[PDB]
Amino acid sequence: EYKIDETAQLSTVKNEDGTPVNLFEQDMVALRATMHVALHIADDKAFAK
Amino acid sequence: MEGTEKKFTFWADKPGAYWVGEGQKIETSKATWVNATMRAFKLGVILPVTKEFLNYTYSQFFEEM
Amino acid sequence: KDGTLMNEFTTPILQEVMENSKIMQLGKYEPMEGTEKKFTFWADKPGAYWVGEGQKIETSKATWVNATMRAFKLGVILPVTKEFLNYTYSQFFEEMKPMIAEAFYKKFDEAGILNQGNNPFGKSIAQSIEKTNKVIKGDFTQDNIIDLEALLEDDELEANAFISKTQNRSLLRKIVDPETKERIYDRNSDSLDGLPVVNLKSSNLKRGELITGDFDKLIYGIPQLIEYKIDETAQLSTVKNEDGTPVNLFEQDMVALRATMHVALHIADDKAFAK
Incomplete structure (x- = not known):
């Protein structure tokens, strides 16, 4: 179950101004990841003379 | 049930x-009430009940009534 | 609200007549979207x-x-409060689905034959009859009915049975034919000429019978869907007045079943004249 805040207009039937619909249309996503830094990394970058 | 009960539904x-x-x-x-x-x-x-006690033929007439 | 209990709901001997009329029309159904016609005249x-x-x-x-x-x-x-208190409302909802399905076939027939709705729009039996102008003016006579049936068979394909609108069938039964035979009299089944006539209730149509044979009728499937989240508000009263439908589960389940019908133009119909 997912709710939309943008409320985009649809081609079929009359367009709705109000946010979120009862019928399923948008897919929910749940993923969490945290990264730790070692404070030591090599890097290379190009610079104009 | 006592009285009358009726139900109607429209779609x-x-x-x-x-x-x-x-x-x-x-x-x-x-x-309905x-x-x-x-x-x-x-x-x-x-009048027939008094005759029913005395006569046998009038006793059967009371049951038929 | 929900004070006195009635414990009664209306069921059968009403929706069966509407379902029988739709089945009597007979039309080919296809699963694939769209249609195709054949090449004619050289x-x-x-x-x-x-x-x-x-x-x-x-x-x-x-056609789509x-x-x-x-x-x-x-x-x-009103039914939402009754459903939580009484178990009979849940059983009544299943009977209501059958009535809604019968109304779905009735609305498709009324848009074409009676031109009440805009379901078919282009392919309509009443619209084709108005364009061709085959309809007879005034009251339909016993001799005139035989002449109208013969005229349709000469120009186009012959129809098996003419459509009845309940009130029109009663007026036809009163009229008697010129020959020694009863006209529009039903002993066991009602028939105009040979085949059994179908009766259908219509708001727009009141007088005059239309005869049609070749008619396309296609359906996607059965009308059944689960109810979730409130949508489209018209009238609501329980504790506080609301303009837009929100909160809780849906009060009535909305059913979806696609239906398409194509007309070949065969109906003539009859209309009463006014002075």
Whole structure:
């Protein structure tokens, strides 16, 4: 179950101004990841003379 | 059940174009009050009842009445 | 609200007549979207030792229509409080689905034959009859009915049975034929000429019978869907007045079943004259 805040207009039937619909249309996503830094990394970058 | 009980339900027709689901259902109830009572025997059967106790033929007539 | 209990609901001997009329029409159904027509009419030359005129006409016609059953609002709002208290309302909802399905077939027939709705729009039996102008003015006579039936068979394909609108059938039964035979009299089944006539209730149509044979009728499937989240508000009363439908589960389930119908133009119908 997912709710939309943008409320985009649809081609079929009359367009709705109000946010979120009862019928399923948008897919929910749940993923969490945290990264730790070692404070030591090599890097290379190009610079104009 | 005592008296009378009747129930009626009506459904509403839905729109052609798909946009919103229409509901609203009609309901009706019917009930009747007061029942008629049977009339009791009076002086007419009372004259025959005295003959029923004495005569055997009049006793069978009381049951048929 | 929900004070006195009635414990009664209306069922059968009403929806069965509407379902029988739709089945009596007979039409081919297809699962694939769209349609196709066949090539007809080609020019031929009569002149000797010459090629002459040579042209063949090709025809192609696609048909697609989407239908959806409307959900209740006014009656459904009262039913929501009764459903939690009584178990009979849940059983009544299953019977209401059958009535809504019968109304779905009735709305498709009324849009074409009676021109009440805009379901079919282009392919309508009443619209085709108005364009061709085959309808007879005034009251239909016993001798006039036989002449109208013979005129349709000469120009187009012959129809099996004419459509009845309840009130029109009663007026036809009173009239008697010129020969020694009863006209429009039903001993066991009602028939106009041979085949059994179908009775259908219509708001627009009141007087006059229309005869049609060839008619296309296609359906996607069965009208059944689960109810979730409130949508489309019209009338609601329980504790506080609301303009837009929100909160809780849906009061009435909205059913979706697509239906499409194509007309070949065969109906003539009859209309009463006014002075």
